[PDB]
Ligand binder design. Sequence first.
Ligand SMILES: N[C@@H](CCC(=O)N[C@@H](CS[As](SC[C@H](NC(=O)CC[C@H](N)C(=O)O)C(=O)NCC(=O)O)c1ccccc1)C(=O)NCC(=O)O)C(=O)O
Ligand SMILES: N[C@@H](CCC(=O)N[C@@H](CS[As](SC[C@H](NC(=O)CC[C@H](N)C(=O)O)C(=O)NCC(=O)O)c1ccccc1)C(=O)NCC(=O)O)C(=O)O
Lengths: 209, 210
Amino acid sequence: PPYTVVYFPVRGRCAALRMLLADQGQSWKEEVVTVETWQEGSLKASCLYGQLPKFQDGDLTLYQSNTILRHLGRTLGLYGKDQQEAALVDMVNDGVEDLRCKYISLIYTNYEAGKDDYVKALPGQLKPFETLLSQNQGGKTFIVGDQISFADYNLLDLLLIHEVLAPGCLDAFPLLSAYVGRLSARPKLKAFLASPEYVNLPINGNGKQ
Amino acid sequence: MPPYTVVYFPVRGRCAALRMLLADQGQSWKEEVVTVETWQEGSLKASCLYGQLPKFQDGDLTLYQSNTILRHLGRTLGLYGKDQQEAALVDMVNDGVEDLRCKYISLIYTNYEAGKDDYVKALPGQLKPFETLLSQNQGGKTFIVGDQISFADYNLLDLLLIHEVLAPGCLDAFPLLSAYVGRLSARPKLKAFLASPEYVNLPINGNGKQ
Ligand SMILES: N[C@@H](CCC(=O)N[C@@H](CS[As](SC[C@H](NC(=O)CC[C@H](N)C(=O)O)C(=O)NCC(=O)O)c1ccccc1)C(=O)NCC(=O)O)C(=O)O
Ligand SMILES: N[C@@H](CCC(=O)N[C@@H](CS[As](SC[C@H](NC(=O)CC[C@H](N)C(=O)O)C(=O)NCC(=O)O)c1ccccc1)C(=O)NCC(=O)O)C(=O)O
């Protein structure tokens, strides 16, 4: 620390890492960049891949949302108990990211024409996470092992945004449904999820969800 | 029997980098090849976590997701930076490689004919960040992060090799990336692997485009 998040005024790709920071009792600074400021161009040019989020951890400057999650996971002990679990955490996170990618493509490039097919395909896209839960302590703890990992925060966000896109999408999945409820009730996270800081930001940048 | 098994289609694709890594690190592995006809039968696919390959076995640990495999071999073989800060930098590089890889995969499989001109025009802007990273690490003379090779080097190396095939001369604009490709490619175990039929006789992609 100290931590700084630099991003647009949306949940988007910072939603998970914010949940992580809040639930872990960490303090951070939000540096909000408006689309108008972004269009000026100087900040963009300074960014490694010309994109946000940008993250500061003292003198360390990071880009890439999953890089930031993994860094926080590594430094805060949210990356499994050992190498085997770390691999499983990665495997979950990479699966979350694949579905997030599809979600983002839909939202920004093909929402109207593409939504019906996306929603019909969604159960098949969620099932692997239900299966993973079913294979770990009967779904009663976390997505990997006995302690929370960065992948839990990312999967939780993925599930929350999909409940908005396709209400009822988890009804067929009892372990996932219970998992969302349980994690969302963790006291610090619950307070964050209730706060205007979360509630009053849109999920995406284009008014679609 | 080797403790590593790679289960994939008969293509370089998303296994090229992890194979280079294993070869360059002198690790033994087994290749289990899945034909497109075998895949269509559906049972293997149904058994894969996300319905896709590669699948990788390290003893009884079964992994899916190409970057998960890279990170796993990175941790277990000591190719993930010297400390926590370097490990984050290695991740930042690999995540950048995979963004460009994704763009490349979309071009190859969904829009090659119509998209290629635009893609190659945009390519220097997409490679520049890696040249910038090289320029800020020991003048580009060693690796992408730090002074030891990482899994991100093998992934970046593969990304660069396949782009030279797509857009020959694309690294002429980037002297550090150019020298880097030559340098890593000359590492003895890797050089042997890259020249071997095991590598050369597989196509880069599954649809004949490159
Ligand atoms: N015409 C598009 C604009 C281009 C675009 O960036 N499209 C996005 C979806 S826009 As979103 S998140 C903001 C974005 N950052 C990233 O994509 C980082 C990805 C990285 N792999 C990571 O995980 O960190 C960004 O900074 N864009 C600026 C730029 O490139 O100039 C949003 C939109 C508006 C307001 C707030 C947030 C895309 O397809 N990304 C791919 C991905 O997420 O992997 C448009 O209309 O928006
Ligand atoms: N909707 C279809 C998907 C079809 C598809 O796979 N499209 C590809 C390009 S085809 As290539 S790589 C072989 C593959 N695995 C992956 O894509 C895993 C991606 C991942 N995040 C990772 O890093 O591991 C696959 O299993 N395809 C078959 C399938 O999905 O049933 C190839 C090589 C040799 C022979 C044929 C094809 C795509 O666009 N992938 C995206 C990406 O690579 O990130 C469906 O699933 O039914």
